[PDB]
Structure formats: C-alpha cells, structure tokens
Amino acid sequence: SLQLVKKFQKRLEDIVAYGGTRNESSVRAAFQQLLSDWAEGSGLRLITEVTQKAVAGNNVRPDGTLKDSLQQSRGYWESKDEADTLDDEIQKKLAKGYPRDNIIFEDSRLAVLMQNGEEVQRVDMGDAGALAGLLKLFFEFEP
Amino acid sequence: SLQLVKKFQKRLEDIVAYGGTRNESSVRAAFQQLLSDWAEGSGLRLITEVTQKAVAGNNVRPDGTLKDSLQQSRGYWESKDEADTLDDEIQKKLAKGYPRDNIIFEDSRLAVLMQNGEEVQRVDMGDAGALAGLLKLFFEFEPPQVLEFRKAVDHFKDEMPHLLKILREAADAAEQKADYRGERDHFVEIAKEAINPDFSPRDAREMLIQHILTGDLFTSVFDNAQYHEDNNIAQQLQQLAATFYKGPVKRDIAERTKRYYGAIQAAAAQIADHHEKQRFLKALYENFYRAYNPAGAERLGIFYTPGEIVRFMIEATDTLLEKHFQKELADKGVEILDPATG
Amino acid sequence: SLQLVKKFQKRLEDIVAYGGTRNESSVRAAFQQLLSDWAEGSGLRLITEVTQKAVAGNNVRPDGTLKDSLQQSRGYWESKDEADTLDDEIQKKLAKGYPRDNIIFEDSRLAVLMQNGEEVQRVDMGDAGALAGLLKLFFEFEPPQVLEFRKAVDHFKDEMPHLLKILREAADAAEQKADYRGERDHFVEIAKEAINPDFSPRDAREMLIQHILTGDLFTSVFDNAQYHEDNNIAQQLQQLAATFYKGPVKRDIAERTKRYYGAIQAAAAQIADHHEKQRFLKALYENFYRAYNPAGAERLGIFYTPGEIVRFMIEATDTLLEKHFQKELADKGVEILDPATGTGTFITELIDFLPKAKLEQKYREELHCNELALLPYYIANLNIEATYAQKMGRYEEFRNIVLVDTLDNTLFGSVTAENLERAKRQNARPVRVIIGNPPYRANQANENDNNKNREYKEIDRRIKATYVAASTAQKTKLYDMYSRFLRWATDRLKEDGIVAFVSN
Amino acid sequence: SLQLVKKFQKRLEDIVAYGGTRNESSVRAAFQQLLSDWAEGSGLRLITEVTQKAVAGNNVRPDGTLKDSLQQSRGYWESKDEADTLDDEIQKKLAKGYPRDNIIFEDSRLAVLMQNGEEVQRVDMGDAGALAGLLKLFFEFEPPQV
DNA sequence: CAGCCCATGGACCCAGAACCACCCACCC
DNA sequence: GGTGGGTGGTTCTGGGTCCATGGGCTG
DNA sequence: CAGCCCATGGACCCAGAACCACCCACCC
DNA sequence: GGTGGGTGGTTCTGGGTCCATGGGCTG
C-alpha cells in the first residue's frame, strides 16, 4: 500500500546521509527491498541481476527480475542514477535488447512503466499514493 | 534477534527456489536485507559498494559498508560465491587491502568474522542462533575512535585540577572588576534565599566556575551551544559570566583552557552516540568537586550510580506496580519523581 | 635544514669520544636532539618512550613520537644500536606490532623510513644532503587524517544546495512574523547608503542566510564562536537574525542541517593546522554563491587566487621597494592596502612573510583590508586573526578590515559606525603599496540576464578623463572592473608606491 | 645560563602540552637538553646513561654522566617523576649504590646538588635565578688537584 | 540632441576517452 | 582457470560563441 | 536546664605486588 | 648468542579507625 512506499523513501534518505553517496549502486538497495517485499506479500519475489538473453543474442542484465514459482519471469526492474534525464537512458537500455514486456525504468525522482512497448504511466516517486498506484499495476500485469 | 535471522534462513532457500540461481550477485540480496535491517535499529546503516581506498593507494569495494551518522565506517561485509572456498578467497581479497577492521567474509553456507586481523568465529549459515551471535559481535565492536575517547576521558580527570586553577585565576581576575563585585552580591543573595540559607561568595565563584567550565564543553564536545541561552539558571548565571567573558578577557581564558579542552573536543567529535558523552558527563560531575570542593562533595555525597542497579530497578518497579496496583509504568498518570538526580 | 644534520653528526662523534659509549642508552641521544630541533620548526614535538598499544595489544614503546597540539602522533622513531643489523631487527620489532605508518628505524649508522609498510628512503647516515632530505619528508608526511578533511571538503562542496534549501525555507517562513518583517526593512534602509545603493529585501535575506550558515561553521569547524560576538557587522545582523533564529526554531534548523555539517566537523576536529582548514574557508567562499546567488558571483567576480601568484606578488614588491624607492616591506610607513580582499589570502601570506619582531606594529596599523560581500568579509577577518594566532601568539582582533565599496569610498560603510570610522582612518592613511586581485567582469551573458556592473559615478568619471579620453577606440571596454580598480589604486597612491594587480 | 634556563622552562611545558604525559621517561628530555647545552660552552659534555659501577653491586646506571674530554666522570644527574617524594627517592638511590661525588637530584620543580659527600643548597626549578646559581656549581665544581 | 551607425573582446564546463573494479558466462 | 564482456564509477584532457553597449555622427 | 554521661556505626585509599618492557653486562 | 639485573611503568588487590554528636539524666 502506502506504508512500504514511504519506507523506501526513508531508506534512500539514510543512504545519502550515512554514506553521502547518491550513486545508484548504493541507492538501489532501498528499491530492491521495497520491490522484494511487496512481491513476497503478493506471492512473488525479486531475484536480482539475473542475466536475460535478447532476441539478437545479447546477455542483458536488469537490476531486478520478478520471477515466480515455476522459475519463469513476470517483470524486470532497471534503476538509473538520479543524475541523468531518464527518458534518455530508457532508450539506451532498450537499444541493447532490454525486455519490453513489463519493465520499470526508474530514476530516484521518476518511475516509468513500459508494457509491450508503450509508457503506461510516469509518477513522481515522492508522492506516496501515486507510486503506490504504479507499483500495484506492475505487480498485477498478468500475461 | 533469532527472529530476524529466522527469515534469512528462508529467503536464502527461497531465492534459489523461486528462481534457480546460485551465483553470488543473485543470492547476496538475502544477507543484504538481514544486515541492513538489523542495523536500522543499532543506529548504523549499511551503504553498499563503497569505493573506500586502501594502503598502496588501490581502490577496493566491499559488498557492504556499515556506516554511522558521521559517515565513519564501523564495519565491512563481503560476500563470495558458495563454490569459491571462503577460507582461500579471504586472503586473496585481504591482499588487495580490503579492510581488516571488522570484515564479514560470507559464503552461502559459512560466515567468518575477522576483528583486528583475527578470525573471531566461523559460524555455519544454517543455525539462526550462531549467526545472530556473530552479527551481534560485529555490531558491538568498539571502533578505534571510542578507545581514543576513553583514553582522553582519563586524561581529563588528571588535567582537571590545572584547568580549574586557570578558571580560579579567571574568577579572581573577575573579583577585581567592580561590575563583577556588584553582580556577585545579586547572585550570592539570590541563590542563598532560593537554594540554601548559608550560600557564600566563594560558593557563587565555584558555581560560576562550573557554569563556564561546562559552558565551553557544552558549546563544542556537546555542541549544545543553545542550552546556555534557554535554561532558566543558565541565563541567571550568564550575567556572572559576561562580566569577565568579554573580548580580550574571554579570549585569554578560552585559549588557556584550550590545551585541556582540545583532547576531549576532538574525541567527542568523532563520536556520535550520547552514551559515550554520558561517561564524560559522569566524570565532570565527580572529578570537579574531588579536585575543587571535597567539602561540598561530602555534603552533597557526589557519587554516580551503577547502570545495572538502575536497569534492574526499572524492571522490578514495573513488575511490582503491575502486581499490586495493576498499572503499567507507561500508563498515563503514574508520576515518577527523582529527588536526588545527580 | 642540512645545518641541523651536520650538528647531529658532530653530536654523534661527541658521544663516542667524550663518553666513549657504544650502548643504545647513549649512542641515540644525538638523533633525539636532531628530530627535536627539526620538529619545533614544523609545529610538532618529539616525546620519548610514549607507551603505545600494538595490533596484538602488547604495550610497545617506540623510542619517540611526533605528537601534535591535539596530542595525535604524526610519526615514530626507533633508534637501535650502531652494531646490530637494522633490516633483520626491523622485521623482528615489527612482528611484536611496532608502528608502520611513518617510523624512522635508525641505528646510529643508517636511517630507513618505512612509510605505509614501505621502505622509501634507506639513506646511509653521515650524509651532507639526502639525510636532510629524509628528515624533510618525515616532518612533511600527510597524516591519514588530512586526506579525510580533503574528502569531507568535496562532499560539502556538493551537498551545499540541499543544505542551503533548509536555510532558504527557514527565511521564507520567518517572513510571517512582524518582528522579522519590521527589522528586515530597517536593515535595507541602513544598507541603502553603505554597501549597495540598490539593497533589495532579497539581498537582506541573502546576508541573513550567510550570517547564520557561517556562524555554525565558525563555532565548530574553526572553534571561534566569539568572532561573531565581537565583529561589529555580526552584531548589527543578529539584531535581525535573533528575531527568528530563537529557541525552538533555532534548535529545529540546527538539527535539520546536521546531516550535512556533521562529517566536516568530524574531520576538521582531527586536523590542527589552520593552513589546512583554510582550504574549506576558500571552498565555502566560492561554492555558496554558485549554489545560491550566481548573480552576485558575477559582478563581484568571487574567485580565489592560487597562493603561488600571491607569494610571488609579495616577494616581488619587497624586491622593488629598495630598488626604485628605499625601504623593505617590514619598515615603517609601508602602509599596504588591499582592496578586494576576498578570502584574505593577500594579508594572511603577508603576515607569514613579515618577521616575528616587527610583525606587531605592521599587523596593528599598516595592514589594511576592504570588502563588499558578507561571507568573504567574515572569512577574511577570521583567517587573518587565526594566522596571527599561528604566527605571533595571542589572538588580537584585526581592526583594519571594512565593508565598503572601494570604488565608492571617495557616509560610506555606515552599516556600523565602527566600520565607518575604520574606513575614515584608512582614507586618512598615507598608503604605499596597493596589492590585490580585482574583478575582471565587464558585460552580462545575454540581455535577458539583467546584470550590469554598478556604474561607479565618481570612479568612471576619472576613467573618462584618463583611460577612455586617450583611447579613440570606437567601442569602449575600459570601464572593466579591473580598469576601474586600477584608476582607484593610482589615485590612492600618493608618491613612491608599487601598484601590483593581477588581471585580464 | 639565564636565557638558557629561561628556555628549559619552555620545553618543559612543551613535553606536557604536545605529549600529554608526566611519566619520568618523557619529561627528562628538557633537563637533559639544558645540562648538555650548558656543558658544551664550558667545555664538558653530559653523556646520558653511562652504566657506572658500584662498591657493593654488579653494576648501576645513572641517567646523566658528565664525562670530560679525557673520559673521566666528574658529576652525574638522577631524574625523578613527580609521583615519588624526591627526599625519599634520594635515600633509596644513595643506598643501592649511587655516587655522591657530584650528582643532581632533580624532580621537576625542585632540585638539590648532593656534592662530594654532602648537600649544598636546595633550589626550586621554577625560579630561573635559583636553578642558574646551582647548575653553575655543578659545572664549576672541580676536583682538589685542579 | 537624438536616433543611428560601428565597433571589439568577453573570470568555464562538459562530452568523450581511458581505465578500473567486480562478477558472470564461456571457453580451457 | 583465464577472459572477454556487461554494468558502473572515476579521473583526465581537449577545446571552443554570438552579442553587449558606449562613442562618434549624421541629420 | 544545663552541663554531664552514654552511646554506637562510619558515600575509600593504597602499599605492595606482581609483572612486563626495554636493554646492557655477563655466562654460553 | 643468550639471559638475567636493573630501571621504569602499570595495574591490581587485599584489607582495615578513632570519634562525632543527640538524648537522657541531673544538679
């Protein structure tokens, strides 16, 4: 709901204070936890950096890989640094053969959801109620 | 908490089950969660992939870095793959310079705590209890900066008499100013009729020495610089300080006491927890009178209490209140007075 | 210096000639005195048999330790006997846990430095050159703590907007009061005759922010809280700040700004040389404007001048004072003004140049300073007084800095009656050197910027009668702030003077 | 002598201001320097810690041993930490088997010169003029043949 | 005098590129 | 067992624009 | 009542005492 | 080449007094 969403923000604010680093390498840990928990709470998981292979044969590596019990993939997460126009890095990722089924291209400020090939929604990750909406949609997108 | 480790035992298997991966980068998320969550409470936080530099100037990246509010590393975590024999791989990355302060080398089935270049324990990953013990040892390590604070607190006890001698000279130089002599009568008379009917100008000078001693320490090692301009009696003795704490006069006293303050000032800057400051507060409360007014320190019996004595007291008080009056200690209405605070 | 090295070699033979002793208890006394005399020059001191703890814990006892003013060790010394081989016993002593950060293993015949577990200089002793090299390197090693004060300086250089946002929010929410709103409109009036004839309510808000921000750093990073209680300018402004920075509000803002100020004050406490802490004074001076008001950073041209240029510009004026006139910087009558003082690097390096005898008279009434902005003024004053403490002895308020628009000081500096009369005594002085670094700004980015260098009526009038007059250039760019400062400097200079500026 | 004693003071406070210890081992560096410097101009030299023999013993070890240009001991100094009561450290010392031909018993703020079989005068080290007069005699004491 | 011509040099900053650390698939 | 390749971070280093705004002059 | 008699437990220091660390003079 | 005395720090640890001062007699 909204509680876990607020918890993610708290964690990220501690990363940029106890470490001072706003690099994704350290910031991603916050969203990793949020995504992994909403998942277990809705019958799933968030196995991390599982190498996927593209049609062109490129071993891509999303930061996440919502997988389910029979070991199949349902979603993929990819967080970019909070220091770049997001709609530019989305293109670069997809141009390597990145999955287009249900991918959360997320920077620390904005979270974009793509499904099939269209931007379903873009939310300020700060608004608790708004992200709570987008995150729920990603976890409910069934094939 | 075996509770928090209980969940690690499952998330490790779950992450290999709901997705058939075994590689380190995919299975290390479980231990990340465990460490970061336990830390949130202890006061620390785990910042992952910190590019801390090492001896010889090469740059290294532990899997996690337990940092505190002053961005001061207190412990490092590092995870290898289950296949990679932890023992052999430990020395491989120790050569690259990975810190030996408090590093947890952790494979999927075994973990090794290494405090001060020495393997403390090698808990297996299956037992929640053993793992919890290892993690508790890792979380309760006194960093170099608290052994250094502790050394300095001892010196401050030995430097106390000479620092107080300089404060006596400051109060005697004040006793030569007529502005101070007038301000003295107001305080002596006031404190007498308001605290104890036999107050003396020397007791007022001693109280001023406490005010200015605690004042400089409270504005640096405690950094509560506002305390002295919001507390009723702090502002009541602010006139007694200002009289001789002005421009050149203040400078002289401050610089004279700086050689004693400097030691505990630096020490309490690289510390963040109030519990460390509490030791210095107790030392100041006692040593001052022992090295200035032992006559007062018998009429006020200034001695500090054991922590275990008041911890056990607090447990007993709640259980007794909840067996005769059936009320909790936190039940709104139970007023608790502390006559002799100290 | 190599002189001290030769003195040690004369004491080494004296011990084995007068006493004829070859025992460690007596062949090391020479090196003890040598490091001791070098150390007193650097600012540290060698304290013998300091019982230290080892990696195992076993109490070890390096024969000496380079203790600081905060009793921290910058290095160690282990004198052994002339006879025993050093390289074997270096590896046996080290096993018990002896230090390895900066230890000089000596044996009255060979001195080795193992710095960071690394042999850097195995100078065989009895040397008329590289032994002095060894001791120089040892007494100039970088403590592991100075490289963290550097790391924390850069973080703050980049988490300054986030910290400034807190202070910005505070000043907006204070405008709800009628005590703030009333006193911030009297600040504007007093400052519409002193520094900026176009002082806006938003300029008064900027000054308030700087005052508070630097107040918290001056009492912690630099330990000098009494500066703000003595400085005339601070007092005129706390009248305006303790209208909102009070009790609860004061505490709230201070505790919200801690996750930024914390680390800097936890590495600035472990260094104890002001010259290293001056790197932050510079950083704050520039970064603040780039993270808050770049419009000010433009016309004022806020920038720091590298020390090499400054030191050259000081020794060169001294070597010209006897050439064409006849004096020496440390004489009597060499009144050295410096408009545009900024971080104060032009008067701090002068203090270090002047000898430690006549410095008193020069610091008191021959060194003068001039500033327009608040942050530079405060930083410069504090820097000069702290450099005086590091050089002469007891802190003595520098009473020759002012807040006036140099080009307009020809009722100027009326912010405080103190700075007004301070700039009146300055004006009355027969100034002889005009050193400094003027702004080189000239024109705005694009005309939608709205930022022209204030037309200095009095000063540009003589430019028009002198530089512009002769120049028949169709376009006239002689109204540059650098050329305006040059005009002011030539007119302050009476006779026998050396204007030294660095500009476009 | 007077300017020199007035600098032994500076380097005394310096041991405690920089090091932060009052243990004998570290506070002895100030008096060592003073004695050596004074002796240099006069001609002699304080060679520190020259193991000296004893009437009853295997060997003893003073901490100062003025040895002249011809390797002959003509004066000594035994330092003391502030903790010990100097007077009772004297009898403790001159019983084990310590010399009395010329020895300076100095604590840190008071000094005696037990010279050739008897104490001369006891001076405080805080007073420059006092310590000057006494050290002069430690250096102007010459054997009877001279 | 007032529009209307004619100058003339201007206090940085950010994209690549090299390269490095760490781990993963894939030749070995 | 190496190794090249994906992901991300950290230093260097190279390399360069339209347009503001006072004088000089027609008119 | 004042001026003698009768109780009756007391908010810590410290002198060795090991014991070690360094290191020089003597047995190996 | 060991190897104990010999100087110095260091941290334990075992062990133990005369005498204030209110009240109840008390002349």
Ligand SMILES: C[S@@+](CC[C@H](N)C(=O)[O-])C[C@H]1O[C@@H](n2cnc3c(N)ncnc32)[C@H](O)[C@@H]1O
């Ligand atoms: C380059 S900085 C000073 C340089 C200084 N040496 C340093 O290293 O920081 C220019 C400074 O001149 C000051 N200043 C003083 N009077 C000024 C004036 N009349 N016009 C422009 N700037 C002035 C500004 O406040 C600004 O901080």
Ligand SMILES: [Ca+2]
């Ligand atoms: Ca990423």
Ligand SMILES: [Ca+2]
């Ligand atoms: Ca790892």
Ligand SMILES: [Ca+2]
């Ligand atoms: Ca040695």
Ligand SMILES: [Ca+2]
């Ligand atoms: Ca001694």
